[PDB]
């Protein structure tokens, strides 16, 4: 019996046991989501616990098996995944202390309440109140109270925990041999393969910097345009040259520029197309909407949906007693069971949502043949990107005309195209600078480049330099602004979002080329092209068996991330933006402060 013979038999049985328990846990979760009741919670917890315990034992058994000895790449990848064992190394009470810190911060974020200065009695919870206020208010005073209040109560409480938070995370990382918690995080992108598919954690950081420098011009032009539009609503408040105030961006954390759109529409008179009432006129139903989405996938050549999925999936909001989670989700229960849980109302947005959910389910179907350890998307970004491109093609007018919801007579015009492009830009272009800086700061803090005494100071300076955002009122070291965001509080990496956006555009450009669409990238539809679907399918099939660089190469011909397709998509808008911003100043000055 050789080294790998022992390894393969062990992996052999691990898989069998895992499949059964994973399924039981999944079923319990589905039951709780569909009907919310207390014992459904209890049953859910019990199933989850056993699955986790089983995994830990297997991981320990895996680690006492040399990996270098194995000579088969497929087997080694599988053993590698079982062998990671990241938190096992840390001491038990160190373990306990860390768990307590994490639970505490999550609770503080969830229960945090900010009370109005003007009315002591009025106190607003973030989830059903504070966001609404920030979303709708056009009053500088009101936006300010909300921003400051959340800042003061939650951030100050969070900071002592956060500091202890950081120290222990770094300690376990070094015990696990990673230099710091940051590369512990950076490890997933890292891949090793013999003929130049090698990737390393060091390389990822450099690649991110290069992409950022390239998209820099487009962002600044957008910043200038937004600058002028807001000047109309808030003339006294914003001095042109100066950076935009943080509170006025429309989101508490400023992640998305989407809600600024009513203020910023390029052409007020022309309306963005909506087919909702057309669906109402034609008596469309939720089942009807799903059926049409399935048809789009069939024409591109990807397999149609399963018999079983239609029956078990909850496609409509349950009536009467049952209580449900509103958020749409796609479920791969396991054992051949695929379900989508959502509440569907007849609206244009829902038609688009259905297409996106279906895309996720298709990839799940594609990688089923792969082994249990390898049954996943190649990288964090890839799975989301695959769902996204499908929605884009559904949204194009030609597809709607073929459906018949859009009349044949309707002709798109230049004004509508510009309006559509700007709306897209606010959501896509705006998010990238924020995402980059957030991850930037966290990584530096983990390695210790930034001293604790200067943590807030550095964070605010960075915001001015990169995102062109300046704090309304100065903030003390006691405040912990990064912690206020949910992902930071709940320890979730945000690097995935940046990468996904780059991947999606590359995929679209390549697919359109196979389809031979002639014209603008925004106009292209991949519908009714068998060939485009086929090559997408090949990438979907491989799953995690081979590296991410290899997979990207198969569909687009390039091993690395390329920001050029993103620029091509937004090029017509860019020319228009340049003409508007030719007269006004381009760029921002860090010095200007609202507080001054």
């Amino acid at each position: 019996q050789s080294t790998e013979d022992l390894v393969n038999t062990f992996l052999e049985k691990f898989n069998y046991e895992a499949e059964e328990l994973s399924y039981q846990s999944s079923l319990a979760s589905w039951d709780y989501n569909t009907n919310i009741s207390d014992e459904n919670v209890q049953k859910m917890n019990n199933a989850g616990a056993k699955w986790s315990a089983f995994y830990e034992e297997q991981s320990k058994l895996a680690k006492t098996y040399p990996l270098e000895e194995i000579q088969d790449s497929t087997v080694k990848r599988q053993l590698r995944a079982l062998q990671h064992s990241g938190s096992s190394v840390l001491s038990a009470d160190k373990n306990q202390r860390l768990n307590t810190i994490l639970n505490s911060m999550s609770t503080i974020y969830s229960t945090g309440k900010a009370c109005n200065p003007s009315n002591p009695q009025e106190c607003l919870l973030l989830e059903p109140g504070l966001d609404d206020i920030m979303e709708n208010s056009k009053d500088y005073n009101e936006r300010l109270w909300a921003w400051e209040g959340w800042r003061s109560e939650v951030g100050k409480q969070l900071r002592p925990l956060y500091e202890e938070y950081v120290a222990l995370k770094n300690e376990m990382a070094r015990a696990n041999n990673y230099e710091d918690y940051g590369d512990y995080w950076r490890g997933d992108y890292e891949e090793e393969w013999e003929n130049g598919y090698n990737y390393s954690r060091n390389q990822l950081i450099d690649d991110v910097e290069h992409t950022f420098t390239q998209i820099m011009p487009l962002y600044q032009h957008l910043h200038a345009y937004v600058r002028t539009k807001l000047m109309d609503t808030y003339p006294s408040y914003i001095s042109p040259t100066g950076c935009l105030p943080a509170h006025l961006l429309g989101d508490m954390w400023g992640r998305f520029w989407t809600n600024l759109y009513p203020l910023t529409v390029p052409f007020g008179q022309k309306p963005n197309i909506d087919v909702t009432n057309a669906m109402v006129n034609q008596s469309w139903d939720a089942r009807k909407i799903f059926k049409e989405a399935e048809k789009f996938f069939v024409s591109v050549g990807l397999p149609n949906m399963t018999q079983g999925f239609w029956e078990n999936s909850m496609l409509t909001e349950p009536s009467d007693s049952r209580k449900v989670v509103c958020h749409p989700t796609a479920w791969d229960l396991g054992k051949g069971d695929f379900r989508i849980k959502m509440c569907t109302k007849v609206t244009m947005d829902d038609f688009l949502t259905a297409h996106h959910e279906m895309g996720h389910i298709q990839y799940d179907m594609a990688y089923a043949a792969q082994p249990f350890l390898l049954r996943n998307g190649a990288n964090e970004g890839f799975h989301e990107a695959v769902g996204e491109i499908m929605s884009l093609s559904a949204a194009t007018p030609n597809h709607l005309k073929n459906i018949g919801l859009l009349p044949p007579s309707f002709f798109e015009d230049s004004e509508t195209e510009i309006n559509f492009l700007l709306k897209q830009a606010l959501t896509i272009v705006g998010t990238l600078p924020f995402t980059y800086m957030l991850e930037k700061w966290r990584w530096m803090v983990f390695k210790g480049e930034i001293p604790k005494d200067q943590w807030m100071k550095t964070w605010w300076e960075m915001k001015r330099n990169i995102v062109g955002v300046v704090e309304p009122v100065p903030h003390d070291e006691t405040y912990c602004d990064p912690a206020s965001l949910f992902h930071v509080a709940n320890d979730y990496s945000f690097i995935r979002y940046y990468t996904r956006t780059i991947y999606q555009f590359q995929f679209q450009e390549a697919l359109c080329q196979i389809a031979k669409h002639e014209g603008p990238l925004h106009k292209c539809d991949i519908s009714n092209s068998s060939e485009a679907g086929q090559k997408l399918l090949e990438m979907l099939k491989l799953g995690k068996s081979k590296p991410w660089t290899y997979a990207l190469e198969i569909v687009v011909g390039a091993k690395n991330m390329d920001v050029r397709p993103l620029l091509n998509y937004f090029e017509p808008l860019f020319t228009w933006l340049k003409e508007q911003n030719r007269n006004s100043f381009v760029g921002w000055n860090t010095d200007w402060s609202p507080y001054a």
């Binding site: 038999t9 018999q307 079983g308 054992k335 051949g336 069971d337």
Partner: protein
């Protein structure tokens, strides 16, 4: 001489694949007409014979093999196609074939909580030779010297199938009867 083939065709319980039951039906006459007509069988394939001539053909010492396998395993029951269950649980001689019948029986054999009664053998030393039955439950280990409970590298050879109602069709339980026809070993028991 005609005897109903219905009762082994339909039974309360069909055994597990590792303990495949062998039935000798001889001097029992089946028209074979219903075989062609009914669509009760999702898959009906006779590798050995065209089956157009089955009704006229005289049958000697026919054998029925009954077992429950999941749907994916049905193709494994074919000439060659060794895989795992053909290799370790039921072996079909490549030269000799009769008719294979497979039908989904999800509602009878599967339930929401699940049915774990059926079993398959995933680990064995050596390969099953044609039409040979291994019923033994050894402790198992590639090095020999079996360690009965928690030691490294020793594992039990039998795994439960775990059929569930919510699962996909390949996962859903299939009951399969393989009839094997011995040609001219003795004067035909069935004519």
């Amino acid at each position: 001489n005609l005897c109903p083939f219905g009762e082994v065709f339909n039974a309360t319980k069909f055994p597990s694949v590792y303990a495949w039951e062998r039935k000798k039906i001889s001097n029992c006459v089946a028209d074979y007409s219903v075989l062609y007509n009914s669509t009760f069988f999702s898959t009906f394939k006779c590798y050995g014979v065209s089956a157009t001539k089955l009704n006229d053909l005289c049958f000697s010492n026919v054998y029925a093999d009954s077992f429950v396998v999941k749907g994916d395993d049905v193709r494994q029951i074919a000439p060659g196609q060794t895989g795992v269950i053909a290799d370790y649980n039921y072996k079909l001689p490549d030269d000799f074939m009769g008719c294979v019948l497979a039908w989904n029986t999800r509602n009878i054999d599967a339930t929401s909580t699940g049915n774990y009664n059926y079993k398959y053998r995933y680990l064995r030393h050596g390969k099953l030779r044609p039409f040979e039955r291994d019923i033994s439950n050894v402790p198992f280990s590639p090095d020999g010297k079996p360690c009965t409970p928690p030691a490294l590298n020793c594992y039990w050879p039998l795994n439960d199938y775990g059929f569930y109602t919510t699962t996909g069709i390949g996962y859903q339980p299939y009951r399969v009867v393989v009839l094997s026809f011995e040609l001219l070993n003795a004067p035909a028991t069935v004519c």
